Structure 1
Amino acid sequence: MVILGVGYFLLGLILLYYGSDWFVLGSERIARHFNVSNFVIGATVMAIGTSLPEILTSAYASYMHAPGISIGNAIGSCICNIGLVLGLSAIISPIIVDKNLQKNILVYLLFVIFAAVIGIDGFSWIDGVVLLILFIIYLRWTVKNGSAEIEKNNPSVVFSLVLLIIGLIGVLVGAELFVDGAKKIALALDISDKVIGFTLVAFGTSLPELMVSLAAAKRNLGGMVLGNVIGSNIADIGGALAVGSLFMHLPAENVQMAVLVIMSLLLYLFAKYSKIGRWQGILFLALYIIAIASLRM
């Protein structure tokens, strides 16, 4: 059963690779269909789609009386999205942020700071309710500001939705096969360790974002990348973390929240006063490496 683990592992990689490109291509077409920016489609449809693992994971974990895993994933994902995911993407395709997209990033920063402050004493179910509402407000605010009001079953639209949906299924299934495949290899080789069993799943929920953003970066879709990262973080907090708090009070993670706030602030400052390019990406990656080397497992 080690061969089937390798089977799942490689097949997961194949589905992630091609699925992410299809998802990106389908999303880019849908953006042009609805007359919205790539940032908007990245921050809404793409972000929610790729944060489905986090939401399910956080909800399940907190339900199973493991609220540390719930908030643990979620904040961990946010750090991964800025540090690793945006870091790699910025180097591949440097981004100069337009003024009204800078506005969206600022709102994101305020959201993260607000979440951090109310999370100092942990996250109650009331905290979750508030975050979820802000999450909803953010989505509507984002769509409208990035929408161009203008107006059968056109083959261009249908094929667009097919690419998106099948692409999304490809990255989600691919991510599961990757994790399950790796988990069965490790079990077959008796090197299985649940202390690292969670870093495999935590990173696993971040695999769709990683592959999607890289694919978009390869096609110079910087707005989509930034949208995906910003939207996924908010979805991780206002969605994944929030739902977790509904089942059980989530323990405070003040160190990790502080790290996220600092990384979010840096992201805003770079977007506002400079660019998100090679050296900003290098800094993000360096910080991420420092985080995974120092933060508690």
Structure 2
Amino acid sequence: MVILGVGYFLLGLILLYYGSDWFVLGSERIARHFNVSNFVIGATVMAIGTSLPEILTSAYASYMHAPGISIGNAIGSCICNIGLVLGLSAIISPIIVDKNLQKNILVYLLFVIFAAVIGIDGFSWIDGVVLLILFIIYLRWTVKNGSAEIEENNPSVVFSLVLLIIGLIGVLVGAELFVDGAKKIALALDISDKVIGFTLVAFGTSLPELMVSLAAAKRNLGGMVLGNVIGSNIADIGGALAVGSLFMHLPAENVQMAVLVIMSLLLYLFAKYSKIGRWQGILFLALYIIAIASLR
């Protein structure tokens, strides 16, 4: 079983490495086609695509009477996106946020704060319905103020959409092969733990945003990474968390929310009055290191 474990594992890495690049390249071409910013395409299409794991994970979890996993995976991802994902990207490719995007990040902050307050008692199904609607409004609002759309409306768009979709299939399949392969090596060597078994799928639903952002960062597409991080967090709260609430009340996790809010606050302040580069990225990483060392 270890043999096909090494197979699934390494193959997933290869599918993640190349899949992320194509997904980045395809998204970048679509944004130029739609005459919107890389932030927009990252906050919308890329975000939703790379948040599909969390949506399906917590829908299944809350349905299988494990709402702790549900809210845990949604919140955990949000912290990982800002901490690890955005942390590495800011260092690789620093970014200066224009004021059209600062307004968008401020909305993100207000959104999270809202989610944190109504979640103090936990998350009812009504809460999910509310958060899901704001998710929809945000998407439409993000598209329309990031829209300088003009055209009228063949072969150059087809190659773009193909590159994007296949790139997305690459990272989604590549990420779950990574987890399947790691799990298979983990039980064949008999080193399985039921909570580490959660930690690999926890980290697994963040592999898309991680690899995708690393690809965009190395092509100086920080604005795309930024939109991807902002969009994924909302998609985690307004989508993954929300859907989980429909099946069952999610228990309150105020410690992680407080962490998320602070990191979200820091994110806005850095974007509004400073930059998102090295020492900001280093700070994010540091906070992420502390978080994974002390949280529960």
Tell me the secondary structure at the aligned position of residue 27 of structure 2: helix
Question: How far 1:151 moved relative to its partner?
Answer: 2.2
Query: Tell me, what secondary structure is at the counterpart of 1:193?
Result: coil
Superposition RMSD in Å? 0.9
* Cα displacement (A) at 1:152: 11
Aligned to 1:203, the other structure's residue is in SS state helix
2:143 aligned residue:
143
Find the counterpart in structure 2 of residue 62 from structure 1. 62
How far apart, CA to CA, are the structure 2 residues paired with 1:218 and 1:153? Answer: 32
Would you say 1:116 and 2:116 are equivalent positions?
Answer: yes
- Distance, in Å, in 2 between the alignment partners of 1:271 and 1:42 is 17
Q: Aligned partners of 1:121 and 1:75: how far apart in 2?
A: 16
Question: Using the alignment, how far apart are the partners of 1:24 and 1:203 within structure 2?
Answer: 20
- What do the CA deviations read for 1:229-257 (whole angstroms, capped 9, x no partner)? 00000000000000000000000000000
Contact 2:14–2:174 (8 Å) recurs in 1: yes
| Cα-to-partner distance string for 1:202-243 (whole Å, 9 max, x where unaligned) | 000000000000000000001100000000000000000000
Q: CA deviation at 1:169?
A: 0.1
Whole-angstrom CA distance in 1 between matches of 2:150 and 2:269: 34
Change in Cα spacing, 1:174 to 1:153, as seen in structure 2 (3 Å) is farther
Whether the aligned pair in 1 keeps the contact of 2:36 and 2:149 (CA below 8 Å) is no
Following superposition, which runs of at least 4 residues in structure 1 exceed 6 angstroms of deviation?
none
Q: Distance in 1 between matches of 2:265 and 2:9?
A: 36
Gap change, CA 1:56 and 1:6, over 3 Å in 2: same
The Cα shift of 1:194 comes to: 1.1
**1:86-131 Cα deviation digits (max 9, x unpaired):** 0000000000000010000000000000000000000000000000
Aligned-pair distance for 1:195?
Answer: 1.1
Distance 2:107 2:152 in 1: 38
Correspondence 1:200 to 2:200:
yes
Give the Å deviation of 1:153: 9.2
CA contact (8 A) 2:47 2:232 kept: yes
Deviation digits for residues 145-192 of structure 1 (CA, Å, limit 9, x no counterpart) = 011121299211000000000000000000000000000000000001
State the SS of the aligned residue for 2:195: helix
Segments of 5+ residues of structure 1 without an aligned counterpart are: none
Q: What SS does the corresponding residue of 2:20 show, helix, strand or coil?
A: helix
Contact in 1 for aligned 2:135/2:235 (Cα 8 Å): yes
- How far the C-alpha of 1:137 sits from its partner, in A, is 0.2
What is the rounded CA distance, in whole Å, between the counterparts of 1:86 and 1:172 in structure 2? 19
Cα distance in 2, alignment partners of residues 151 and 80 from structure 1:
38
Q: Identity, % of aligned pairs?
A: 100
Cα distance between partner residues in 2 of 1:222 and 1:209 = 13
Partner of 1:247: 247
TM-score normalised by L of structure 2: 0.99
Q: Which secondary structure does the structure 2 equivalent of 1:121 belong to?
A: coil
Specify the SS of the correspondent of 2:257: helix
Aligned length: 296
More deviation in 182-191 or 144-153? 144-153
Q: Aligned in 2, Cα 1:152/1:109: closer, same or farther, shift over 3 Å?
A: closer
| TM-score, reference length from structure 1 | 0.99
8 A contact 2:123–2:251 mirrored in 1: yes
Which deviates more, 259-268 or 143-152?
Answer: 143-152
* SS of corresponding position for 2:275: coil
CA distance in 2, matches of 1:163, 1:284: 31
Please report how far the alpha carbon of residue 38 of structure 1 lies from its aligned counterpart in structure 2 after TM superposition. 0.1
- CA 1:218/1:178 → structure 2, altered by over 3 Å: closer, same or farther? same
Contact 2:65 2:248 in 1 (8 A): yes
Matched residue, 1:21: 21
Q: Which residue of 2 aligns with 1:183?
A: 183
For the residues of structure 2 that align with 1:93 and 1:35, how far apart are their CA atoms?
Answer: 23
Aligned partners of 2:15 and 2:125: how far apart in 1?
36
State the alpha-carbon separation in 2 of the partners of residues 284 and 18 from structure 1. Answer: 26
Indicate the SS of the match to 1:122. coil
CA contact (8 A) 2:41 2:227 kept: yes
Residue 13 of structure 1: CA displacement? 0.1
Supply the distance in 1 between the matched residues of 2:287 and 2:151 (Cα, whole angstroms).
45
User: In 1, distance between residues paired with 2:167 and 2:152?
Assistant: 24
Change in 2 beyond 3 A, CA 1:255/1:14: same
Question: How far apart in 1 are the matches of 2:90 and 2:47?
Answer: 18
CA distance in 2, matches of 1:100, 1:154: 31
